[PDB]
RNA sequence: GGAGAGUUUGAUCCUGGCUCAGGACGAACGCUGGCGGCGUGCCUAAUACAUGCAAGUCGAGCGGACAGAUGGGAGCUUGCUCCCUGAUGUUAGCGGCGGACGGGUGAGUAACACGUGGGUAACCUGCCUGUAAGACUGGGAUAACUCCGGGAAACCGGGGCUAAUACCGGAUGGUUGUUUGAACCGCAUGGUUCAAACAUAAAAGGUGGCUUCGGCUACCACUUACAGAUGGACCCGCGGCGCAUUAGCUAGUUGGUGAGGUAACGGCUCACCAAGGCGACGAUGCGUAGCCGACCUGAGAGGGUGAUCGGCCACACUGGGACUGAGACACGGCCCAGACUCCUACGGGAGGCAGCAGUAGGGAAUCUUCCGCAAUGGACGAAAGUCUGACGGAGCAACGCCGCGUG
RNA sequence: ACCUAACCAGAAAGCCACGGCUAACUACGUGCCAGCAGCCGCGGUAAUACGUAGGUGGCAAGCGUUGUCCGGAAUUAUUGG
RNA sequence: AAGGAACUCGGCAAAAUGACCCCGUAACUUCGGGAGAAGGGGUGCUCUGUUAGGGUGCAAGCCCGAGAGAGCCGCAGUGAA
């Protein structure tokens, strides 16, 4: 439920603070992207010492939404803050740590590095 | 990686427990004789002065008192207890 | 207490103590209470003269020697004669 | 058997508005370590007027007491010279 | 105990700067390079760290536990094991002390931080002297030890059992607090000394040796009271720095009263009251910086630096916090948070080289991952001893100083 | 460590400077080119200044360059403008 | 719901902010402002408590009441306009 122009706060030590969406990547196409969905983005605000700066267009990956993650087993994951982790052209992240809890559905994507770098994968 | 006196760490835990029991018992007894000095009670004033006195010297005479602070506490408590009973 | 013991001094080839009275646990080449004595190990051999007029006040005013301080101050006639100070006990 | 010589220099009366502490600082001389010529200067001080019987502008100098307040060190001695007013 | 010379001019003198001769380093670089002795060697990034050692000790405190001379009985092998007693030796845990000294580094801080000089009728002091009293009567615990358990580990939990120099009642004790009677003297606070009532401890320890086996005694201990000594704590005078292109600052601030607090006065912290206080004699603010004995230089006044040795302060990955203790807000102790690394069974754990070396970075720039408690100082001991990267030494570098040589 | 005996002169000397300040001089090459330099300043075919060679002078298991501090600096002056 | 100006010539429109008390408030200036700048915190009830203190009254009596300490309960304390 993260369509175009949705300011997602970042969840790593890559330098960034607020990420602005541009286009969800799937297809012609779509207008929503729930959890684990790669987005083309920019960065509106940043911690001042960072390799990814303000005004730089680097892709990202959702981790958490206030929208639900719907596991196929009845239970629903839904966080209270939106998220991003920033990717450099392959699914190894540019970040170093990944803050906060993390939706476990990323592991069923190809993000097996991103799961290992993140504390509470639930 | 503590080389020696890790058992000093465990002795600081157990000694901190027993010392907290005696010292906190002294503070609670001092509030007890102070509470008995709160109201105008004669016989509880003198016997409770004996209670906070005996527990006071028994606390300051071993460990964390030590001497001058105990004389300050028993002195002011003696002033209030001597006030409420003459 | 103040353990009146030795203290190194001299070159790196030969050390010669000059055993001033010192604190309980001061540094080795550091602060001392009130220096009285000097006694090199060598030269020739072991010639050192001590105070005994204030050093009796130091050894009687609450103190003790080291090993070499006890053998030296027992050799110069100060520990025994101080014991004759305590012989009027 | 007296050994302690806690003594204070006699100075004028600067102000007594601070209640129970009428403090004023007296002036001594100094030599300038490069040039040589004499240059004096004041040195302020609070003075704990216990009776509060000081006069502002009356030269009375008192000796230095213990730490009595936040930077009030000298006790009073006597009103040595009264103020001449009117 | 002090030396000047060059350089403005077509020539001259003044005035005026600019440079050189001299010394010095914690130097580096260029060339070269025999030795010895004595000192010196991360000054830049308090940057991060692989690996080893840097604080242990007490069997003469404790209850074990194991081995075991020597002795005992069995089976066989004519030499062995099996089960007991036991000199003896060893140590995991409890407890006492020591990790607050020692070692390192200048990150901080422009004031009580340092130096100096007073003061403390405002403090405290374990260990050690010396004095003199005491060490009486009891209690219930608990780690060890096992039986189950949960954990990947780190590790926790629960049930049974024990002891001490562990802890905890009572008597006794003033001196340790509260009330009174005084006596003497001060620095406002008040201090010193005498008496009379209410409270406050003790390892009966251990070691030996002796004995009548009741007990005796010495030594090393335990407590209490005193003074001594060693240490730190506090307050204050004075001194040591660039800036006015920093003149405002301050509201727990200035002062009172009251209460609480600490070893202790104190807005130290709070309640209530008042409106104070600091400043051209430089407040505040920016900057920089550990300070001193001292070192280098100067004829001297002065100018510069705070290496190595010492004295004090500070800090211990960053930032708080408190416990144990006499004493820390603790460098190789804990709790929390942040950073960075390592482990992971993803539930959670582990770390602090500004100790000695040592590696990477930084840079022009700085070394051996060595020997030993023989000395001196420590620590623990009854001592024997153990630990001691302090120290005593060594290894490298012409890095400095001095001596000798290459005839 | 130091002592004693033997052995062999055998293995053990370089760095900077040579106009002035400042001890220390001539030749070849170069010809405002390459260069030096602390300041003064040299070098445009006779260079006591650039390199090279002999010699000299300083110093010595060391010698120069640079960094910083003091003096010279009476160029912060109280001494002393 | 989730996202918030991507709708649109244009935040049109709606949503939002708002009452007192207190803290605090910049550039700029014509020196008055700006400035309700900005940005924040408190409020409901019970008791202490015929509070402190005022107005009024001879007392009785009412009114007008800051400020605080304890405590209550709610998602919510100018609970609404």
Swiss-Prot record, chain A:
Keywords: Ribonucleoprotein, Ribosomal protein, RNA-binding, rRNA-binding. InterPro entries: Ribosomal_uL14, Ribosomal_uL14_bac-type, Ribosomal_uL14_CS, Ribosomal_uL14_sf. PROSITE patterns: RIBOSOMAL_L14. Part of the 50S ribosomal subunit. Forms a cluster with proteins L3 and L19. In the 70S ribosome, L14 and L19 interact and together make contacts with the 16S rRNA in bridges B5 and B8. The keyword NAD does not apply. Belongs to the universal ribosomal protein uL14 family. GO terms for biological process: translation. This is Large ribosomal subunit protein uL14. One of its GO terms (cellular component) is cytosolic large ribosomal subunit. It comes from Bacillus subtilis (strain 168).
From Swiss-Prot, chain B:
Keywords: Ribonucleoprotein, Ribosomal protein, RNA-binding, rRNA-binding. Signal peptide: none annotated. One of its GO terms (cellular component) is small ribosomal subunit. GO terms for molecular function: small ribosomal subunit rRNA binding; structural constituent of ribosome. Part of the 30S ribosomal subunit. It comes from the Bacteria. InterPro entries: Ribosomal_bS20 (IPR002583), Ribosomal_bS20_sf (IPR036510). Belongs to the bacterial ribosomal protein bS20 family. GO terms for biological process: translation. Pfam families: Ribosomal_S20p. Binds directly to 16S ribosomal RNA. This is Small ribosomal subunit protein bS20.
Swiss-Prot record, chain C:
Keywords: Ribonucleoprotein, Ribosomal protein. PROSITE patterns: RIBOSOMAL_S16 (PS00732). One of its GO terms (biological process) is translation. The keyword Ribonucleoprotein applies. Transmembrane segments: none annotated. GO terms for molecular function: structural constituent of ribosome. GO terms for cellular component: cytoplasm; small ribosomal subunit. InterPro entries: Ribosomal_bS16, Ribosomal_bS16_CS, Ribosomal_bS16_dom_sf. Pfam families: Ribosomal_S16. Part of the 30S ribosomal subunit. Belongs to the bacterial ribosomal protein bS16 family. This is Small ribosomal subunit protein bS16.
Curated annotation (Swiss-Prot), chain D:
GO terms for molecular function: rRNA binding; structural constituent of ribosome. The keyword Kinase does not apply. Keywords: Ribonucleoprotein, Ribosomal protein, RNA-binding, rRNA-binding. It comes from the Bacteria. InterPro entries: NA-bd_OB-fold, Ribosomal_uS17, Ribosomal_uS17_bact/chlr, Ribosomal_uS17_CS. One of its GO terms (cellular component) is cytosolic small ribosomal subunit. One of its GO terms (biological process) is translation. The keyword Nucleotide-binding does not apply. Part of the 30S ribosomal subunit. NCBIfam families: PRK05610.1, uS17_bact. One of the primary rRNA binding proteins, it binds specifically to the 5'-end of 16S ribosomal RNA. Belongs to the universal ribosomal protein uS17 family. This is Small ribosomal subunit protein uS17.
